[PDB]
C-alpha cells in the first residue's frame, strides 16, 4: 500500500515533473538553468544559439522512467530500459543525473547548480553529448536512432537472463516498421523457464514527425484484436482528461503493478510446474499508453501562424511538439514568455533547491546502487561478459598433409567446411550451455549445421507435431524457426552487448537486409569504446553462406557478395572479414573470432562439398596472420623474383586460381611466380582517416607476398571487383588482373557459376599466360598453343553444360598435384 | 461456374498444370510416358535435379480458381506470387492458355515443345527456377521474400478496375516488410485505386519449419487481421484429400470476395463511401493448401520410420525443394515417380500429340484477360513517361555575378525545395500517374511547394487542425513510417507503367539496400527477354546526407549507398550528385525520361551556395561531367599542374574555396576544375553492360589529364569507390576527399573537417602536391600552408565553445579567380 498511496504517487509526480524540467531546459539553454529559483532572470547570454533536440517524446519517456523506478523498489526487480524513440535522448540522461549514476560515470557532472549547467551546454553541443540515447547514455545498450529493433534487442538481451525484465518503451510510429511489426512474434521463441521477460509498452502518444500514426488512429478494440492474435495480454493507460496527472498516475500504478505481477506468475508455473511447455504461448502483458505527445509542454503555436477555434495550431497533442517547440534562441528571444511560462508550470522550486541538488524528500523515489536501471551491469557489457569456453578447434580438424592436399576426404561431409564448423560449434553448446546461441533465418538445416541438431534442437514454444516437424523443442540453443533476418540480426546484437556470444548465420544475398543493422552496431562499439567507463562487449559474429557459387536450386536474385565491400568502409579496427578457403582455416578463424573484443566478425563460408588444402598448422598461420605465401603452391622461393603473383580470397576463387597457375606451370614450369592465400581481407588495405590501421599491413610485409609495383597478380576473388582495385590503388601497385565477381548468374551447373564472371581457372590462365607474352617472358608458339587449348576447353564447357546439365571432367575429376620442379 | 460438372473440368486442369510442374523438375524427354506407351529410362532424366515442389500444387490450384474468377465476373486480374521459389506455377498455367508459346514460338503447345520446355527449366542456358522477367505474366520474381504485398499495393495504386490476385507465403508472412504490408489498406482508396485480393498459402511449412502463422489458430488469425481492418475467409478441409471439397468451398470463398469487392467499390464511387476515415473490410482468404498436396506423403525407400511409415513429405516441410533423390545416375525411387506421376490420370488430361484434351481449352481466358497476357505485368496498361514542364521555369536566375553566392530568398538556396517546386507542376500536369513517396519525411526533406497541390493519402480518420495535408485522396504517400512500404509501392508503381519518386534520409535508405538489388536484377533481366516492353525508372533521392545533420548524429550517417550501387551492372544504373539546385532540376528532366533504370540521386535540402547557371546545369546534367571555365585557369585536353574535381555539394564548395585558396596566391599554377554529376562515367569495370556511359579514354583525359596529373576530388561518399575508379583508368595522382566515417552532433562546417573533406585541408594537399612536383618556392608554400593550419587551429577552438562556426567559413564568397 505505501507504493501505491496518493502521498506517494505525489512525490513519484514531483520527481518525474524534475525530469521533464530538465529535458526541457536543456534544449534552450546553456547556464542558469533554475533561473526562477535562484532569482536570476534568463539573459540573452544564457540561450542556446541554435537550439537542438526533441521534446514531444521526452515527458511521456520520463513518465513510464518514474513509474519503472517505482516497479523496481515496490518488487526489488533487476530491469533495464530500452528507448524505442531514440531521439529522446533527455529521456534517459537526466533520469540517470538524478540518480547519481550520470555523476558516477561523468565525475563533472555533479548533482548541484554548477554541474547542472554543465550538463545543460554539453546537450547536443559540438564535442558535447548528442540528442539520441547513444552509447554515452549511462544505462543504453539501444540508440534508437534508426527505428525498428527494440523489441528483438530486447529478447536477445532476456534470453538465458531469467532474473531480468526489459521495460521497452516502442514508439508508435517505430511500431509501423517492418523490423518492429514481426518482432512481436519472439513471444514465440521466449521460453519463461529459461529466459527472462520483455515488457513492452506501446508509446501511443498519437504522432511521428509530421503525421499522425496507424496505431493511435486504430480503435482500442482493434488494437485488443491485433496484439490478442499475436498471444499478448493488452493492458491500457488512458484518461479522456489528459491534464488530470494524478489520474494517470493511479492507473499506470495499477496497470504496471499487474504486469509484473502476472509476469511473475508466468514465470513461477513455468519454473515450479512446467507450464508452457506444451504449445501454451503465456499471455504477456502489454502495456498500451495513450500519452500525449508533447505532453505537458506548450500547447497551441499562439505566437505565429493560422488559427482555429481562437487559438494557434496545436503543439502539444500533434506532431508540431515533434522537435524544437518554441522558435526561442540567443538571437530570437521573442518566445521567451513562452519558455518561461512553461518551465515555471513545473513548479521547479518545490523539485530543486537553490544550489541545484534535488530536494530532500524526492532522493529517496529512485533505486540504489545496481538496482538503477542505469548501473544495471546488463547495460554495460553484461553481468557476465567473460568469452566462451573454447576447446580446441584442432579436435575437429581436417587430416590433411602433403599426400591428400587439394583433394576430397572420403566422407563427403567432411569436405562441406560449415558441417565441419557444426563440429566445433557443437562442442561448445556442451561447454557454454547458457552463454552460447545460434541463430537463423529457416537456414539452419540449409547451411549445413548438422551436427548441432546432435546436441540441441531449435527453440519453439508453439505446439510440436512429430514427425512433421523435427528438432524442435520449447528448450534450445538455436532459433532458427522464424523467417526474418531482422529477427536474427537483432536477437543477436543484444544478446551480444549483454556479454554473451553467438553467431547469425544466414544466404549471403539475403544478410544484405540487414546492411543498416550491422552499421548501427558498428557505430556503438566504436562511440562505446570513447566512453572510459564502459566495458567492452563480446564480438558479433555473422556468417554469408549459400554464396553466389553455392546457390543450385536458387537463381540470379540469391547472388549479391556485396557485405565485403559495405563492411570494409567502416573503420577497419572494429571489423574483422574473413574468407576461409576450407574447413581447416574455417574451424581456425572462429577460435580467433571467439576471443576478439568489440568486433563485427563476418566470415564468408562454404557449405558444399570442396577440395581441402590447408593443414593445421597452416591453418592455424593463415588465421592469426590472416595472410600468406604458400610454398608448395609458389615456383618462387624466399626471397627470389617473381613474374607475376598468384593470389585469391574465398573458397571458390582459392580453387580456380590454384587450379589456372597449376594449368601454367604444367606447360611452363620456368614462369616465377608466388601464390599468396588472403584470409583477413582488411590487412590489405590502407585507407584515410584513422582507426583503419591497427592490423593493415605495413609497405614492407605488402611488398614481401605482391612484390614491387608493376608486379602482375591475378587475383581470384569471392566479391566485387572495385573493393580489390581499391585496395591496390591504396598501395600504389599497378598491375593488378583481378577476377571477381561480376554481376553475372543464374541456374546452371557449379563450374558454370565460376565460369559466369570468368572467376574460372580457364580464364585466369589465359590472363597469366597472356601478361607473360606480353612482358616476353614465353614464345609465342606457346603462349598461343595454351591459350587456345584454355579456350578449346571453355566451348566444350558450353556445349556440354547446355546439352547435358552436367560440367566438364576438366572442372570435376581435377585434383592437386605437385608443381614441376 | 459453380456446377459439380464445371467444377471437376477445373479439377483436371489443375492436375494437367501440377502434372507438368512436378515432371519438369526430374525430366527432360518423354514427358507424357505413360500416354505414349514409352516408360522411363536414365536418359530421359536429369542428371541433377533442380527446383521446389512443395509450393507449386497449391499456387496452381489458386491460379486455377483465379482463371475461373476472370471468366465468371469478368474481371482483370493478374497473379503475384509471394513463394516465387515455384516458378513453374506460373509458367505452366501461361503453357496451358497459349501466352508461353506467343513469347516462345519454338515451346509449342505439342509433345515436342513440351519435351522443350522440361528441358529448359532450371536448366544451363535455359529458364530459372524461379517467377522470373522470362515467365509472362510476372512483375515479382519472389526470390528475396516479403514484398509481394507492397508490389501489389503500388501496382492497383490508381488503377481501378485492376485486382492483384497477390498470393503470401506462410513463412513469407513471419518477415518484417510483410508483415507492416498489410497496412497497406490504410492508403487505397476504393474510390481512385484497385484492390488486393491477399491469399495467406498456409501450407504448414517454411524450408525445414513449421510456420508461426500455420500453428496459430484460426480464432487468433481472426483477431490478427480485423484488428488489422480485414475480413477473414477460410478455406480448409479435414480430409486434406477430398479435392472436390476445397474445390466447393474455394469457389464461394473467392466468388464472395470479389463480389464484397465490387461492393466496396460501388458504394466509394457511387455513394461516396469510405472517405470520412471507415476502412472497407477488405478480404483476405487464409487458405490451408498443405504443402506437397497430392505429392508423395512417405519417405517409405529411406529413413527413420514412424507409426509403421516413413517421414511424411505431404503436409510437411520435406516436400520443399526436390522430394526424391531420383535421377539419371539414380533410378531407385523410378516407381514412386511413376505411381506419382500417373496419379493425375494425365490419360484424361493431355492427347497422345501433347495437345491439352478439347474439353478442357475452354477453361482459361483468352487474348489480354489472361494473367499472362494482361498488360499491367508487361510495362503496364500505360507506359509513357511522365508529360513534363520546361524545367527551366523554376531554376534560380544565376550568373556571372551571383555565382557561389546565397540568393536573398533562403529556401531558394535549398535544392529539394527548388525541386519540389518542379515536382508539384509535375503533379498538375500529371493527376494519375505520379506519385511522391517517403517515410514520414515529405515535410521533413522540405518538400514544401508539393503540400500546395496535394495532401497525403490517409485513409483512417483525421482530427484537424492537430492532423495536417492528409486527406483520403492525395499524390503523396508519406503517413507509413516504412522503408520498405515506400519502396515497395513504388515499385509495384514503377513495374505498371506508371513514374514517381521515393525520397529519403540517406543513412536510412540503406535500410532497403537489398530491395533495390532486387528491382536492378528484375529490370536487367527483363532487358534480356526480347518479348518484355520497357519499364520506366525507378527514382529515389538520398536527402539529409552525411554533411547535413544537425538534430540527429552518427547514426544518420552512411552514404555507402553510391557505393552499393555503382557495383551492379552500370547500364541500369544512374547515380547523380548535383551540386545545386539548377543541377538538381536538370538531372530529373533527365531522369524522368530514361527507361529502365534505377535513377539514385544525391541532394541537399539545407541553404547552399548556388553556382551554376541554366545552360551549365543541363550541360551538367546531360553530359554528366564538365570543366568549368570560371573556376579553371587552363582548358581542356591542355597542359596543368594538377585538377580540381568534386562530386556532391559540400565537396563542391569546399573544393571550389580551396583552388581558390591557392590561386589567391599563386595565380600561376594552372588547373582546371571538373565538376562531376553523373558518376557511373568515370568507371572502367571488368564485364559486359557496363560500357554504355563510361568515358573513352580520350574523354577521361581530357578532364583529368594524362596518368600521374595529380588529382584534388572531393566526394560526398566513401573513399574506395573513387580509388576503385582511378584504378580502373590507371590514372596515378588521385588525392581523394571523401566521407572517412567521422561525424558527430556538431557545426555545419565541422562535419566537413571531421572528414579533411574541408576547403583548408584540401589546399594543403593542393600546395603540398606542387612543392613536390617543383613548380613553387618553400617559402611561399610552408606560409600558406603554415596560415591553413592556423585557420584549423582556430576552427576547433571557436566550434567547442561557442557551438557556432568561425567566419572564415560562414563569410566565404565567391570572386573572380586572377
Ligand atoms: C527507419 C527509420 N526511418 C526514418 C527515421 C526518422 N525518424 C526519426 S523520429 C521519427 C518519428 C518517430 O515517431 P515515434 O516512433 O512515434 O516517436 P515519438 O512520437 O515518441 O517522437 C522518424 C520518422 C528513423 N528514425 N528510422
Ligand atoms: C528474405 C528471405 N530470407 C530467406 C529466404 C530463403 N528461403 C527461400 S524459400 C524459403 C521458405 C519459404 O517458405 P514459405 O513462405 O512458407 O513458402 P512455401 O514454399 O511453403 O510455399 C526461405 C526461407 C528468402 N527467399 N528470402
Ligand atoms: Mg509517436
Ligand atoms: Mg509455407
Redesign the interface.
Known amino acids: 500500500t505505501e507504493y501505491n498511496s496518493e502521498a506517494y504517487l505525489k512525490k513519484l509526480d514531483k520527481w518525474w515533473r524534475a525530469a521533464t524540467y530538465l529535458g526541457a531546459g536543456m534544449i534552450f539553454l546553456?547556464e542558469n538553468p533554475l533561473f526562477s529559483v535562484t532569482g536570476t532572470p534568463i539573459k540573452a547570454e544564457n540561450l542556446?544559439?541554435?537550439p537542438?533536440?526533441?521534446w514531444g517524446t521526452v515527458s511521456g519517456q520520463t513518465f513510464l522512467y518514474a513509474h519503472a523506478n517505482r516497479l523496481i523498489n515496490k518488487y526489488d526487480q533487476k530491469m533495464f530500459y530500452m528507448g524505442g524513440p531514440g531521439?529522446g535522448g533527455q529521456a534517459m540522461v537526466v533520469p540517470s543525473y538524478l540518480d547519481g549514476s550520470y555523476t558516477e560515470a561523468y565525475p563533472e557532472i555533479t548533482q548541484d547548480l554548477e554541474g547542472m549547467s554543465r550538463l545543460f551546454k554539453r546537450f547536443?553541443?559540438?564535442?558535447?553529448?548528442?540528442?539520441?540515447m547513444?552509447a554515452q547514455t549511462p544505462g543504453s545498450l539501444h540508440?534508437g536512432?534508426?527505428?525498428?529493433y527494440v523489441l528483438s534487442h530486447a529478447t536477445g538481451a532476456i534470453l538465458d537472463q531469467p532474473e531480468q525484465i526489459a521495460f521497452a518503451v516502442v514508439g508508435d510510429?517505430?511500431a509501423?516498421?517492418?523490423?518492429?511489426?514481426?518482432?512481436w512474434?519472439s513471444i514465440?521463441f521466449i521460453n519463461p523457464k529459461n529466459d527472462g521477460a520483455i515488457l513492452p509498452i506501446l508509446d501511443l502518444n498519437?504522432?511521428?514527425?509530421?503525421?499522425?500514426?496507424?496505431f493511435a488512429?486504430?480503435s482500442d478494440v482493434?488494437?485488443?484484436?491485433?496484439?490478442?492474435?499475436?498471444?499478448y495480454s493488452p493492458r491500457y493507460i488512458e484518461n479522456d482528461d489528459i491534464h488530470d496527472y494524478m489520474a494517470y498516475h493511479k492507473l499506470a500504478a495499477e496497470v504496471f503493478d499487474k504486469a509484473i505481477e502476472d509476469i511473475h506468475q508466468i514465470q513461477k508455473d513455468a519454473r515450479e510446474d512446467n507450464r508452457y511447455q506444451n504449445g501454451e504461448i503465456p499471455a504477456w502483458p502489454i502495456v498500451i499508453a495513450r500519452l500525449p505527445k508533447g505532453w505537458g509542454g506548450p500547447r497551441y503555436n499562439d505566437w505565429s501562424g493560422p488559427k482555429?477555434d481562437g487559438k494557434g495550431?496545436?503543439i502539444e497533442?500533434?506532431?508540431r511538439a515533434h522537435?524544437?517547440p518554441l522558435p526561442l534562441s540567443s538571437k530570437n528571444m521573442g518566445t521567451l514568455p513562452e519558455f518561461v511560462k512553461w518551465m515555471t508550470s513545473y513548479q521547479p522550486e518545490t523539485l530543486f533547491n537553490a544550489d541545484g541538488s534535488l530536494k530532500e524528500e524526492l532522493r529517496d523515489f529512485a533505486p540504489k546502487g545496481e538496482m538503477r536501471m542505469a548501473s544495471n551491469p546488463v547495460t554495460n557489457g553484461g553481468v557476465d561478459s567473460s568469452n566462451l569456453v573454447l576447446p580446441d578447434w584442432q579436435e575437429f580438424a581436417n587430416p590433411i598433409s602433403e599426400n591428400n592436399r587439394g583433394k576430397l576426404l572420403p566422407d563427403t561431409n567432411d569436405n562441406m567446411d560449415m558441417n565441419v564448423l557444426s563440429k566445433y560449434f557443437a562442442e561448445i553448446v556442451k561447454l557454454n550451455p547458457t552463454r552460447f546461441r545460434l541463430f537463423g533465418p529457416?537456414?539452419?538445416?540449409?547451411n549445413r549445421f548438422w551436427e548441432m541438431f546432435k546436441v540441441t534442437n531449435?527453440q519453439?514454444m508453439?505446439?510440436i507435431?512429430?514427425?512433421?516437424?523435427?528438432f524442435?523443442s520449447p528448450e534450445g540453443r538455436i532459433i532458427?524457426?522464424?523467417?526474418?533476418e531482422?529477427?536474427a540480426e537483432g536477437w543477436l546484437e543484444g544478446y551480444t552487448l549483454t556479454g554473451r556470444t553467438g553467431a547469425f548465420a544466414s544466404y549471403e544475398?539475403?544478410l544484405?537486409?540487414v546492411?543498416?543493422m550491422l552499421?548501427?552496431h558498428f557505430?556503438w562499439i566504436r562511440?562505446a569504446a570513447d566512453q572510459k567507463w564502459r566495458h567492452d562487449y563480446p564480438s558479433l559474429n555473422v556468417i554469408s553462406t549459400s554464396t553466389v557459387f553455392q546457390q543450385?536450386?536458387?537463381?540470379?536474385?540469391?547472388q549479391?557478395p556485396?557485405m565485403l565491400?559495405?563492411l570494409?568502409?567502416?573503420?577497419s579496427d572494429f571489423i574483422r572479414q574473413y574468407l576461409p578457403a576450407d574447413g581447416n582455416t574455417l574451424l581456425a578463424v572462429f577460435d580467433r573470432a571467439f576471443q576478439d573484443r568489440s568486433k563485427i566478425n563476418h566470415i564468408v563460408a562454404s557449405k558444399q562439398p570442396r577440395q581441402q588444402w590447408f593443414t593445421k598448422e597452416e591453418a592455424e598461420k593463415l588465421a592469426t596472420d590472416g595472410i600468406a605465401t604458400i610454398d608448395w603452391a609458389s615456383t618462387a622461393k624466399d626471397g627470389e623474383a617473381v613474374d607475376l603473383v598468384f593470389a585469391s580470397a574465398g573458397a571458390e576463387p582459392t580453387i580456380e586460381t590454384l587450379a589456372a597457375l597449376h594449368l601454367v606451370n604444367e606447360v611452363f614450369p620456368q614462369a616465377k611466380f608466388r601464390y599468396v592465400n588472403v584470409v583477413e581481407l582488411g590487412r590489405l588495405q590502407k585507407?584515410?582517416?584513422?582507426?583503419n590501421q591497427e592490423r593493415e599491413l605495413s609497405d614492407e610485409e605488402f611488398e614481401k607476398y605482391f612484390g614491387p609495383s608493376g608486379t602482375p597478380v591475378i587475383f581470384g576473388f569471392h566479391g566485387?571487383?572495385?573493393?580489390i582495385?581499391?585496395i591496390?590503388?591504396?598501395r600504389?601497385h599497378?598491375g593488378?588482373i583481378?577476377h571477381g565477381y561480376?554481376?553475372?548468374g543464374?541456374?546452371?551447373?557449379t563450374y558454370?557459376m565460376r565460369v559466369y564472371?570468368?572467376l574460372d581457372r580457364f580464364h585466369q590462365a589465359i590472363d597469366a599466360m597472356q601478361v607473360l607474352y606480353v612482358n616476353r617472358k614465353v614464345n609465342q608458339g606457346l603462349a598461343k598453343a595454351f591459350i587456345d587449348r584454355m579456350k578449346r576447353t571453355l566451348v566444350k564447357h558450353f556445349e556440354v553444360?547446355?546439352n547435358?546439365?552436367?560440367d566438364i571432367p576438366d572442372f570435376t575429376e581435377w585434383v592437386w598435384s605437385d608443381l614441376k620442379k
Open positions: 546553456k542556446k544559439a541554435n537542438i533536440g526533441h531521439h547536443s553541443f559540438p564535442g558535447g553529448i548528442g540528442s539520441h547513444t540508440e536512432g534508426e527505428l525498428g510510429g517505430e509501423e516498421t517492418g523490423p518492429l511489426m514481426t518482432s512474434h514465440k498519437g504522432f511521428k514527425i509530421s503525421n499522425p500514426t496507424l488512429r486504430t482493434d488494437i485488443r484484436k491485433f496484439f490478442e492474435g499475436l498471444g482555429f495550431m496545436p497533442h500533434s506532431f522537435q524544437v529457416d537456414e539452419t538445416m540449409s531449435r519453439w508453439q505446439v507435431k512429430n514427425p512433421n516437424d523435427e524442435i532458427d524457426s522464424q523467417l526474418s531482422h529477427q544475398s539475403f544484405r537486409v546492411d543498416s552499421t548501427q557505430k562511440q543450385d536450386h536458387n537463381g540470379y536474385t540469391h549479391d556485396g565491400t559495405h570494409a568502409e567502416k573503420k585507407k584515410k582517416g584513422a582507426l566485387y571487383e572495385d573493393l582495385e581499391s591496390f590503388y591504396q600504389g599497378d593488378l583481378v561480376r554481376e553475372d543464374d541456374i546452371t551447373t558454370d564472371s570468368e553444360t547446355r547435358e546439365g552436367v
